[PDB]
Amino acid sequence: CQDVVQDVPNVDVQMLELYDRMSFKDIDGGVWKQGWNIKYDPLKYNAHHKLKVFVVPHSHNDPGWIQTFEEYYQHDTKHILSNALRHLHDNPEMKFIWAEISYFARFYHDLGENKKLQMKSIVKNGQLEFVTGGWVMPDEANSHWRNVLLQLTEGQTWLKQFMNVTPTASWAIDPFGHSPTMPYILQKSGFKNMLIQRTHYSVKKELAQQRQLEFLWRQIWDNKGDTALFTHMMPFYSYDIPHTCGPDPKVCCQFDFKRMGSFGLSCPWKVPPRTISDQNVAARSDLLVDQWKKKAELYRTNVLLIPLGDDFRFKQNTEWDVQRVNYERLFEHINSQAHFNVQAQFGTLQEYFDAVHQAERAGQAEFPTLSGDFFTYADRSDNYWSGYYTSRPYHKRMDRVLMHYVRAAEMLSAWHSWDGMARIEERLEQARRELSLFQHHDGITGTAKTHVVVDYEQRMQEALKACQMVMQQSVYRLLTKPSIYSPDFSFSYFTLDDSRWPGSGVEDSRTTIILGEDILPSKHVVMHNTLPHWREQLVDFYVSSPFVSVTDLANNPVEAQVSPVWSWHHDTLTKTIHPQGSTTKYRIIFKARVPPMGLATYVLTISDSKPEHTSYASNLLLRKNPTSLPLGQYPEDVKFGDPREISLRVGNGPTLAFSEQGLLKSIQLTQDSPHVPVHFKFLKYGVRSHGDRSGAYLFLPNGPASPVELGQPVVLVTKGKLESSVSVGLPSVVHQTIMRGGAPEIRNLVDIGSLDNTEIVMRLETHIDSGDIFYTDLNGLQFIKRRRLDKLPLQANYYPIPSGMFIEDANTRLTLLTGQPLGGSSLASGELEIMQDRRLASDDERGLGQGVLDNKPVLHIYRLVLEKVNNCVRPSKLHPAGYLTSAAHKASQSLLDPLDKFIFAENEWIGAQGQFGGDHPSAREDLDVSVMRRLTKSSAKTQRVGYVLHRTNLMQCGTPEEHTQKLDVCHLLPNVARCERTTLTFLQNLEHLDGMVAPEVCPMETAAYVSSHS
Ligand SMILES: O[C@@H]1[C@H](O)[C@H](O)[C@H](NCc2ccccc2)[C@@H]1O
Ligand SMILES: *[C@@H]1O[C@H](CO)[C@@H](O)[C@H](O)[C@H]1NC(C)=O
């Protein structure tokens, strides 16, 4: 295995180093506004060396943005595809590329057989070519890598099944900045090439000057280069026709033949296109070939890519004709005029890349190696697109909840083969497709219109219900004696209980377990652990009595804690935010221990008085002017006091100190150690009163944030043997610090209310001497080093925080893990900050046509891990990556993939069993089974199950922590007959494995395996 820590890769372009050197001046470069006046030597191309030009027609079809997926399909996309089928069939030299398989599958299944056959024929002959082949063109900032892979696999599995093709070239013209997670996944999914577009205008200028727009993009820790993927970055401001023929949009706009008037489009540079004729074709060709030769100067081969398209183009038959006939006249002239030394034709993306690599093999060019990312994007001036790292945070959090529920549903149901009447495949396909659709670059990014966001939410809610159904049928089958198991596939044997989604104060969605001497003495509950190691985690349930005790299924008592159910209320009468306790529902909390990828059953039993193994939390309400807080049968009366600083310690864990406003002020790791200053603070950013306004995409603050004025907030302290917490009602945020014995969990119930033009940020202030360095993750896959640059504006120093961020010095590190993607930064040494929500009254001029005024309460979750790192083996100062410690990685897993909780729904569970998976191997902590999916329906003689195995890389800090089992996923199901390593989409077999054993993977690697069973 390659060492991902100690060897700094040698690359030609390392983006962090490039950023440190670049000046980012925004000067007027002439017609290429952000470039320079390109010059070329007319003698470069000649009879023996012609410029080969591929004009690639395309149509960017957003699966929701200003209209919903279905509205665009009915109004635009079905017409584009129907006319592409007709026009390509009738014009054999015409070509077209298609990216979004969600729309293609929606169209194809509505086609009659004759047209399906015609469609297959234009794909098979190369006229219609799929690029990427994912369900969508995903956001690359907020998306988790697991969901980028899910949506890629959904689209490519559909293409293999129905079109018999698997794209090896990727097209990503619209995500708002780009992540190396893409080439990581694509290269392990059979790809050979990829194309990107939205990168900072200063980066395009710098790379263009060095002809480094095509490069071998490798991961930041890859010393050898085996992860490298050839990448083409487009050079100009946009992917539309005006910014794709060459450097001068005035000129290129004249070659967009949809802009002469009858289509309602025009050229803003004020010169319209003119129909090509024999009287003007030589002058029009002179102008166009000059643009092409200028664009060609920015690249190293004699093969030039000219995209020809825009949003929802190629819709009308007349548009197909106007673009095709005019370009055919230009090609016929140009290709026959030897003096141009050009051969131009319609082409596809793969045709472009194949010709570039033929040139490279002929020795005509060598390409530079590059590592790093392309965040944060700015398309012009100081307009940095860091707002969408936070926009519509409720749905950003929902993405991570559904991510986990899809994984758990696919894994729980993979253990068995199911009759078609159980509708398991149907519900999992719906869930995978709705989650995949949301990965679109206007879905999770929060950049769609309000009614489109509602559509995505409704689709994800349906997907969650589908996952719950599959999960609860699976648990019933896995834990019921086989000869007693009697399923009704439409029945709810268990309901899921989720404590953090939508969350307390967001929705009253949780069911209370109703127990009573005159109704039901006890209730079974079951926990599922999707991770491949034994895991303990505290779990809680709402119960109708405080006198409840827990037992495992061998009837062994389990220590438990009962706490009240507290809800916070903005009291419009007293004008205070304060908690109210329930007098009939209580929370019972206990430690569940669950096998790797397994299930564990417990029983909750009511008693007439305090049970021997159940303790009760104390509660202290700190506020001036308190009033009583009755809790029914709860055995401990609530205590009151004036606001004051307080300290808490659960177990042998850290001791946390809090200010009189209920916010953390210090963390003491052990009895002897120092109280390390770690202060939480809430602040607000505003919007500019003149100039450009923040909106869904852009963050354009009116200066550094100002502290939220807190008043004298009400603080609630709950102290228990298993769990304690400090909660405070701040303006727009009920902030909660929860302690269970290890790093605390932070929960924020964020309700920005009617605060227009406000962004609420949560900041951590420490004295850690981090300087200008911090680390943020990319798609939940890797941590990349960031350097704050005071030569760039505040918003340029914000980066995506898809799952975590940290700062460190020689001795100390503070890591904040998140349960949802948000934007964040470190704006000064010792600080971390992460945006909670943003409400904006103005549109930011990117086409959305609205601000963001549809905020709703959201419960954000985090873990805060303060650690000593002076003993850790860390990368050298010049390495671009960072790595988590074991405790921070486990904390992230606790947020993203917690235990699932099931409540048996009827009175008696006949045939109940206590555990499933006790014999599953407990794999080393850095290894995960990211995906377990049965790939065959029950009628297949040979069953196939696919696994995606990911190993992260954790710092070695001196903990022996060893003795684990080898996990061979191919032997998890019985009767294995073959084991194969495959691409990550499971679509191509790469290696037939000896002894049917699937080897574990190296740190930072991801592999896929499929086991076949008779
Ligand atoms: O994803 C949606 C938005 O967020 C924007 O990116 C739109 N494209 C706008 C556009 C049109 C022509 C060229 C470049 C961008 C649309 O595709
Ligand atoms: C699918 O594509 C391959 C490669 O072109 C071809 O040989 C095969 O016949 C096609 N259809 C089948 C039989 O899967």
Ligand SMILES: [Zn+2]
């Ligand atoms: Zn788009």
